[PDB]
Amino acid sequence: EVQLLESGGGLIQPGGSLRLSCAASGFTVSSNYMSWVRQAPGKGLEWVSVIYSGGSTYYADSVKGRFTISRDNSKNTLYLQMNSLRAEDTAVYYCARDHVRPGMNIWGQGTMVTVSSASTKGPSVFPLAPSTSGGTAALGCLVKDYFPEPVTVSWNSGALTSGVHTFPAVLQSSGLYSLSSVVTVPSSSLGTQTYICNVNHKPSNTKVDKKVEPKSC
Amino acid sequence: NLCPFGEVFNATRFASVYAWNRKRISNCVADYSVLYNSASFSTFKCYGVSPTKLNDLCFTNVYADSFVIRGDEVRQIAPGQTGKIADYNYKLPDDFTGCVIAWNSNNLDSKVGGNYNYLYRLFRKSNLKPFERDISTEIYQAGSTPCNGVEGFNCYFPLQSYGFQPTNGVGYQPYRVVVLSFELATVCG
Amino acid sequence: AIRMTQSPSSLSASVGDRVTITCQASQDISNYLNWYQQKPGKAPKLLIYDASNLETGVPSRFSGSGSGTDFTFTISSLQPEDIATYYCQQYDNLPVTFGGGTKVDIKRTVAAPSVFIFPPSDEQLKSGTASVVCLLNNFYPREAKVQWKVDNALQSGNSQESVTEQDSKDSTYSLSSTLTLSKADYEKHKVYACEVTHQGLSSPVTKSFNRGE
Ligand SMILES: *[C@@H]1O[C@H](CO[C@@H]2O[C@@H](C)[C@@H](O)[C@@H](O)[C@@H]2O)[C@@H](O[C@@H]2O[C@H](CO)[C@@H](O)[C@H](O)[C@H]2NC(C)=O)[C@H](O)[C@H]1NC(C)=O
């Protein structure tokens, strides 16, 4: 079907550069109105740039002269070149086929651009073992000490979705993020069903799986 | 004999901007005082020439182009401008030698239920060259698959309709525009 | 540049109540105003385009009206999965501007939390750091007080807690409180417990464990 897939976000020092690629399927980029829209953490939406069907480019006042928007007809991909990046450029960057008529408005999923000067650290994953109340038990994974945001956590390679709660990360006094993701399962399946949380941290290229099983001496 | 400028400004019907009308003015004595002394014009900007010093200049041909756009889009009828109108409907060159004249016409070109007779081109693969007149109605192929002249997904009608209603803001009410192009002789003052 | 003002900033209503938010424009923007629904973590999703027109596939309970400068967005009967932050945008005049946003929460019935406590893994204890975790799963309202007690001593300042967004199914929250100690400071005490106080509890519930057992 029709979808927008985008990438290129990550950590970058202030004053540095970073290009965001937005690959399209289902329509032609060189023939449509395309837009970049960023959302700072916890804040609202902020329009960034627009390229017309004919090629005219427009930018917001806060990024004019620093950001550039372009496209490649052979690859059907929308780009966003970012230069002289500042700390206030830190946001999720959605690329969207701008609404022009009934049902053509489609948004990407955004990539996390984190403009900071600290280094990148892959997370450490520790198990949260279930206890011993009769009917239902709880277990999860601790994703501790990583930077920058974000990390993605699933269970049993996506084979487990019901009863899962993945908490938003906390920023510890150390400057690293700490996060936990849990799931409630019936206490019966503890001895026969294996539970593995699948953690992914793109900036460090770290992909970890940890077995979660009960504790005993 | 005198130039037929009264036909253009005092015209009863104006053309849509995509199909902008062109009048070729030649072999006549042009009285430009009827224009720059008129207090009924909201926009009157000249390029490469002086308004009062035009009755002293001879040119080979004078071109008067007239159409209707939004008030928001009057800023685009100027050299080096971009926008839905300047790119896809009416484009002026950077070395333009002439004058752009505009005035509000909400009393004439807005109907109560909404006037839809005035249109603008919304979709085009590339920008118009200076003084290019695109009147195509071909269905716009925005996707990978071809349209074959049928509307649908990724296949849109290239024109869009102004919604000229009297209750519209100043930027959305219809403005009538006349563009004089001076080419360098048969039209003097 | 245009400036969209969106009221209210926050909102809580029962399932089935009529929900209405407004968005006043600083200038005339005709009817070129769209409405988006952004569920937590996901991208914004276009619901209403051109002030009043419903995008194909949106449920009928979503409504929109207005022209000129004052617009409205109406949810006929609020549904649990409608929890999100809703934005308005104008796009005809450049630059494109958004509203402040409206966070919408469900007013459901009271739910008591299920409390679980997790000792630090022996794997982490080899790293010199210990992390004790206390869990509050599927409760309402979000107001909850978590109390750490170490050998009956009330701990504070060494803990960070985290809450999920309203579950799009049951409109319940979940809370995660993380206590961080050194392996030394962890091995100086025996009894670890978290005391949960909540509206759905007639008395505070405590889950405990002893270090080593
Ligand atoms: C545009 O028209 C006005 C008024 O035109 C009226 O309707 C026309 C169809 C025609 O029949 C006119 O005779 C009608 O009067 C013109 O207004 C005159 O403007 C001059 C200055 O240019 C002024 O001295 C006269 O008093 C005005 N006439 C009246 C009756 O007040 C105007 O000149 C026309 N513009 C051009 C460029 O020709």
Short mmCIF file of N, CA and C in Angstrom, two decimals, chain A residues 103-161:
data_model
loop_
_atom_site.label_atom_id
_atom_site.label_comp_id
_atom_site.label_asym_id
_atom_site.label_seq_id
_atom_site.Cartn_x
_atom_site.Cartn_y
_atom_site.Cartn_z
N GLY A 103 -8.49 12.89 0.17
CA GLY A 103 -7.78 11.90 0.96
C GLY A 103 -6.34 11.64 0.58
N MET A 104 -5.54 12.69 0.42
CA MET A 104 -4.12 12.54 0.11
C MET A 104 -3.20 12.88 1.27
N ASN A 105 -3.73 13.26 2.43
CA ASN A 105 -2.88 13.65 3.55
C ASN A 105 -2.35 12.40 4.25
N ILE A 106 -1.03 12.24 4.24
CA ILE A 106 -0.36 11.10 4.86
C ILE A 106 0.90 11.60 5.55
N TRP A 107 1.11 11.16 6.79
CA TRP A 107 2.26 11.55 7.59
C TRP A 107 3.22 10.37 7.76
N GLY A 108 4.50 10.70 7.88
CA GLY A 108 5.49 9.71 8.28
C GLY A 108 5.35 9.34 9.74
N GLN A 109 6.39 8.74 10.32
CA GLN A 109 6.40 8.43 11.74
C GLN A 109 7.46 9.20 12.51
N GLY A 110 8.23 10.05 11.85
CA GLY A 110 9.20 10.89 12.52
C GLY A 110 10.46 10.17 12.94
N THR A 111 11.56 10.92 13.01
CA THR A 111 12.82 10.43 13.53
C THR A 111 13.31 11.42 14.57
N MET A 112 13.98 10.91 15.59
CA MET A 112 14.36 11.72 16.74
C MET A 112 15.72 12.35 16.48
N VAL A 113 15.73 13.67 16.29
CA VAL A 113 16.96 14.44 16.17
C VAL A 113 17.28 15.02 17.53
N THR A 114 18.43 14.65 18.08
CA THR A 114 18.85 15.07 19.41
C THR A 114 20.15 15.86 19.27
N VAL A 115 20.05 17.18 19.34
CA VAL A 115 21.22 18.05 19.22
C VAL A 115 21.79 18.26 20.62
N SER A 116 22.90 17.59 20.91
CA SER A 116 23.56 17.70 22.20
C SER A 116 25.03 17.35 22.01
N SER A 117 25.82 17.58 23.06
CA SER A 117 27.26 17.36 23.00
C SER A 117 27.73 16.12 23.74
N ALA A 118 26.86 15.43 24.46
CA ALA A 118 27.25 14.21 25.16
C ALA A 118 27.42 13.06 24.17
N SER A 119 28.10 12.01 24.62
CA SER A 119 28.35 10.84 23.80
C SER A 119 27.15 9.89 23.81
N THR A 120 27.22 8.87 22.96
CA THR A 120 26.19 7.85 22.82
C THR A 120 26.55 6.63 23.66
N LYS A 121 25.58 6.11 24.41
CA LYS A 121 25.78 4.93 25.23
C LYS A 121 24.62 3.96 25.02
N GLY A 122 24.94 2.72 24.67
CA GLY A 122 23.95 1.68 24.53
C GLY A 122 23.39 1.25 25.88
N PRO A 123 22.12 0.86 25.90
CA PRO A 123 21.47 0.55 27.17
C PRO A 123 21.89 -0.80 27.73
N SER A 124 21.73 -0.93 29.04
CA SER A 124 21.88 -2.19 29.75
C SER A 124 20.49 -2.70 30.11
N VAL A 125 20.22 -3.97 29.80
CA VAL A 125 18.91 -4.57 30.00
C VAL A 125 19.01 -5.58 31.13
N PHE A 126 18.22 -5.37 32.19
CA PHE A 126 18.18 -6.27 33.32
C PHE A 126 16.78 -6.85 33.47
N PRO A 127 16.65 -8.11 33.88
CA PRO A 127 15.33 -8.73 33.98
C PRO A 127 14.60 -8.37 35.26
N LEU A 128 13.28 -8.31 35.15
CA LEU A 128 12.38 -8.11 36.29
C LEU A 128 11.58 -9.39 36.46
N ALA A 129 12.05 -10.27 37.36
CA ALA A 129 11.51 -11.62 37.47
C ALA A 129 10.18 -11.62 38.22
N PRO A 130 9.23 -12.45 37.80
CA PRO A 130 7.96 -12.54 38.52
C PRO A 130 8.13 -13.21 39.87
N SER A 131 7.24 -12.86 40.80
CA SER A 131 7.27 -13.44 42.13
C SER A 131 6.94 -14.93 42.07
N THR A 132 4.06 -14.01 44.93
CA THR A 132 3.69 -15.25 44.27
C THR A 132 2.18 -15.45 44.29
N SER A 133 1.45 -14.36 44.06
CA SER A 133 -0.01 -14.41 44.15
C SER A 133 -0.58 -15.36 43.11
N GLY A 134 -1.53 -16.18 43.56
CA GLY A 134 -2.08 -17.30 42.81
C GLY A 134 -2.34 -17.13 41.33
N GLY A 135 -3.23 -16.21 40.97
CA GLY A 135 -3.77 -16.19 39.62
C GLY A 135 -2.92 -15.52 38.55
N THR A 136 -2.50 -14.28 38.78
CA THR A 136 -1.80 -13.50 37.77
C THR A 136 -0.44 -13.06 38.30
N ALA A 137 0.55 -13.02 37.41
CA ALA A 137 1.91 -12.63 37.75
C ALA A 137 2.35 -11.51 36.82
N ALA A 138 3.44 -10.83 37.20
CA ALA A 138 3.97 -9.71 36.44
C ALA A 138 5.47 -9.86 36.27
N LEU A 139 5.97 -9.44 35.11
CA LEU A 139 7.39 -9.50 34.79
C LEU A 139 7.69 -8.45 33.73
N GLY A 140 8.96 -8.08 33.63
CA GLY A 140 9.31 -7.04 32.69
C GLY A 140 10.81 -6.91 32.51
N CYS A 141 11.20 -5.80 31.88
CA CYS A 141 12.59 -5.52 31.56
C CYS A 141 12.94 -4.09 31.94
N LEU A 142 14.12 -3.92 32.53
CA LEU A 142 14.66 -2.60 32.83
C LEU A 142 15.67 -2.22 31.76
N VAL A 143 15.45 -1.08 31.11
CA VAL A 143 16.36 -0.55 30.10
C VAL A 143 17.01 0.68 30.72
N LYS A 144 18.21 0.50 31.27
CA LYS A 144 18.83 1.50 32.13
C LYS A 144 20.08 2.08 31.49
N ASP A 145 20.28 3.38 31.70
CA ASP A 145 21.50 4.09 31.32
C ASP A 145 21.75 4.02 29.82
N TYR A 146 21.04 4.85 29.06
CA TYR A 146 21.29 4.98 27.63
C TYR A 146 21.06 6.43 27.22
N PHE A 147 21.53 6.75 26.02
CA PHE A 147 21.42 8.09 25.46
C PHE A 147 21.83 8.05 23.99
N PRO A 148 21.11 8.73 23.09
CA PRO A 148 19.91 9.50 23.40
C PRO A 148 18.61 8.71 23.24
N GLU A 149 17.49 9.42 23.26
CA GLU A 149 16.21 8.82 22.96
C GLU A 149 16.11 8.52 21.46
N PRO A 150 15.28 7.53 21.07
CA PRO A 150 14.53 6.64 21.95
C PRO A 150 14.98 5.18 21.86
N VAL A 151 14.29 4.31 22.60
CA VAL A 151 14.46 2.87 22.48
C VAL A 151 13.09 2.26 22.24
N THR A 152 13.08 1.11 21.58
CA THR A 152 11.85 0.38 21.28
C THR A 152 11.93 -1.00 21.93
N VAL A 153 10.84 -1.41 22.57
CA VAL A 153 10.79 -2.67 23.31
C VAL A 153 9.55 -3.44 22.88
N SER A 154 9.75 -4.70 22.48
CA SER A 154 8.66 -5.63 22.22
C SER A 154 8.90 -6.89 23.04
N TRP A 155 8.07 -7.91 22.86
CA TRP A 155 8.20 -9.14 23.63
C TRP A 155 8.03 -10.35 22.73
N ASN A 156 8.93 -11.32 22.89
CA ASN A 156 8.90 -12.58 22.13
C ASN A 156 8.92 -12.32 20.63
N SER A 157 9.70 -11.32 20.22
CA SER A 157 9.80 -10.89 18.82
C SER A 157 8.43 -10.48 18.28
N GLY A 158 7.74 -9.62 19.04
CA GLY A 158 6.44 -9.11 18.64
C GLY A 158 5.29 -10.08 18.80
N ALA A 159 5.53 -11.29 19.29
CA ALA A 159 4.46 -12.27 19.46
C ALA A 159 3.63 -12.03 20.72
N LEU A 160 3.92 -10.98 21.48
CA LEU A 160 3.20 -10.68 22.72
C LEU A 160 2.85 -9.20 22.73
N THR A 161 1.56 -8.90 22.78
CA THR A 161 1.08 -7.52 22.76
C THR A 161 0.09 -7.22 23.88
#
